[model samples]
Target: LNGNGSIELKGTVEEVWSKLMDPSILSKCIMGCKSLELIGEDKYKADLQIGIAAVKGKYDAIIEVTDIKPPYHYKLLVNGEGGPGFVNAEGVIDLTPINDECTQLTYTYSAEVGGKVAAIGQRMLGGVAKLLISDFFKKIQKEIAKSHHHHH
Candidate 1:
């Protein structure tokens, strides 16, 4: 499946970039992400628990960031497997400065699913993906607000 989405962040590009690159922040912000550990520069290992319909399982995953341009853009490669299925995804995130203290974040992602999960239907897959993305952005916004509050 393929989709593109974007979120506006109430922070600077650098702040958003730093937040995205931090495993702790991502683990907290990303829906279903149980843990994220940086293995090397722009590379991470992750654990995720995903629930869809009646199927739920833990995924062991690897994420690699490529085509990076600092606080501007980067491409991501993701591979994961679990009891229900396996997934391979590729995505790109673009960060544009809306102001000195705000950013417009755009994400374009596509994925291929195999195994039992593939039988779930494309519409369901898209809906779940969108819901998870929305939840992730909400978490990021909350975290950023908290961070700003603490700093000031």
Candidate 2:
């Protein structure tokens, strides 16, 4: 399955980049993220719990950042497995500065699912993926805004 979307965040590119790199921030902002730990410079181990239709499972995954340019663009490789199935994904994220204070975050992700999860239809999987991505971006925006407000 493959899905892609972009979100315009209400923060500077640097702030967005910083937040993206921080596992703690990502864990808090990403929907269903249980834990995210930096394993190396740009590699992380993650645990996520997602509920779709009537199926819910915990995924343990590893994510690696490649072709990274600070506050600009990066590619991500992700692999995860759980009781339901396993996933192998790859994606690219581009951060474009709209102005001094806003960043346009664009992402494209594609994944292959195996086992029970693969039995789900494309429409269902696509819908769920979109919803999860949207929720994650919204949470990140809210968290960034709240932090800025408190700091100011």
Summarize candidate 1's per-residue lDDT along 1-152 as a digit string, tens digits: 98887788888888888877777998988767888888878898889887655447888889999999997899999998988888999999899998888899888888988889888888877677777778888888887787711000
Q: Write the per-residue lDDT of candidate 2 for residues 1-152, one digit (tens) a residue.
A: 76666778899988888878777888897666888888988898888887665447888989899999997899999998989888899989989998988889988888897879778877777666677777778788877887611000
Q: How much lDDT does each candidate structure score?
A: 0.82, 0.80
What lDDT, from 0 to 1, does candidate 2 have? 0.80
Highest-TM-score candidate: 1
Off by over 4 Å in 2: 148-152
In Å, residue 121's CA in model 1 sits off its true spot by 0.9
